[PDB]
Amino acid sequence: GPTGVGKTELAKALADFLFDDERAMVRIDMSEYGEKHTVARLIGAPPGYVGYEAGGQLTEAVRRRPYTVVLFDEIEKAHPDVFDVLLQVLDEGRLTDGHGRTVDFRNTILILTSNLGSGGS
């Protein structure tokens, strides 16, 4: 839909109803994943390279606090090496990170947003 409507305000209106918090959602931005090499930067693959101490930009938010609500700001630009990684989340509720752990997503909430809605209803 459009912008400024109350678009993420609906998420925090239910982040406190069922998850009891205002600090329950963890939003990310998919306006950086337009290059084929920075795709694994959200999860951080090997033991031994640049991203190992920092950890996964998606996984290090759910390894602790396993009850969040994720928001994908502007999904509709990213490269389609994200979409299979997004699909395997809702294939089985697991995602193997860079360390080697197996992180459960089977009681979280996904929200994908986009800013179309200019002319056509």
Partner: peptide, 26 residues
């Protein structure tokens, strides 16, 4: 009529060290 004879002492506390853990940068 005894004395006091203030005795001495010895102290010790060691040090640490750090390791650097290079990153292969690719």
């Amino acid at each position: 009529a005894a004395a006091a004879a203030a005795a001495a002492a010895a102290a010790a506390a060691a040090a640490a060290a750090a390791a650097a853990a290079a990153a292969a940068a690719a």
